[PDB]
Amino acid sequence: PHMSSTCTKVLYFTDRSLTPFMVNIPKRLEEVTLKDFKAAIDREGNHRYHFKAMDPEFGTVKEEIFHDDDAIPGWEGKIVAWVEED
């Protein structure tokens, strides 16, 4: 079963693993929201979400995002995220 090109691949780290997980979002990227990431990683409970971003002032940072509806940062079809127990 084959996927479309409107994939965005996500690497995510978890509290409970040393090795990242890789999953895909069936959205482009300018379309992915915390809602979609949430679903994709399908972990349940209370978590905090931090994402690889570039801020023009601080450089590369892990920027926390909270709201289902917020857009999430990525680059060239890739998202990098960290999940924690909250």
Curated annotation (Swiss-Prot):
Domain of life assignment: Eukaryota
Q: In what tissue types does this protein appear?
A: Ubiquitously expressed with higher expression in cardiac and skeletal muscles.
For this protein, what post-translational modification is recorded in UniProt? Phosphorylated on tyrosine and serine residues. Polyubiquitinated, leading to its proteasomal degradation. WNT3A signaling increases DIXDC1 protein levels by inhibiting its ubiquitination and subsequent degradation.
Segments forming domain DIX: 7-86
Intracellular or extracellular location(s): Cell junction, Focal adhesion; Cytoplasm, Cytoskeleton, Stress fiber; Cytoplasm
Task: Tell me, in a sentence or two, what this protein's role is.
Answer: Positive effector of the Wnt signaling pathway; activates WNT3A signaling via DVL2. Regulates JNK activation by AXIN1 and DVL2.
Notes concerning its domains: The coiled-coil domain mediates interaction with MAP3K4 and inhibition of AXIN1-mediated JNK activation through MAP3K4.
Q: How does it assemble?
A: Isoform 1 but not isoform 2 binds filamentous actin. Interacts with the complex composed of DVL2 and Rac. Interacts with AXIN1; competes with MAP3K1. Interacts with MAP3K4 preventing MAP3K4 interaction with AXIN1. Directly interacts (via DIX domain) with DVL2 (via DIX domain). Interacts with gamma-tubulin.
Family per record:
Belongs to the DIXDC1 family.
* Name of the molecule in the record: Dixin
**From what organism does this protein derive?**
Homo sapiens (Human)
Upper lineage is:
Eukaryota, Metazoa, Chordata, Craniata, Vertebrata
Gene coding for it: DIXDC1
| Covered residues, full protein | 597 to 679 of 683
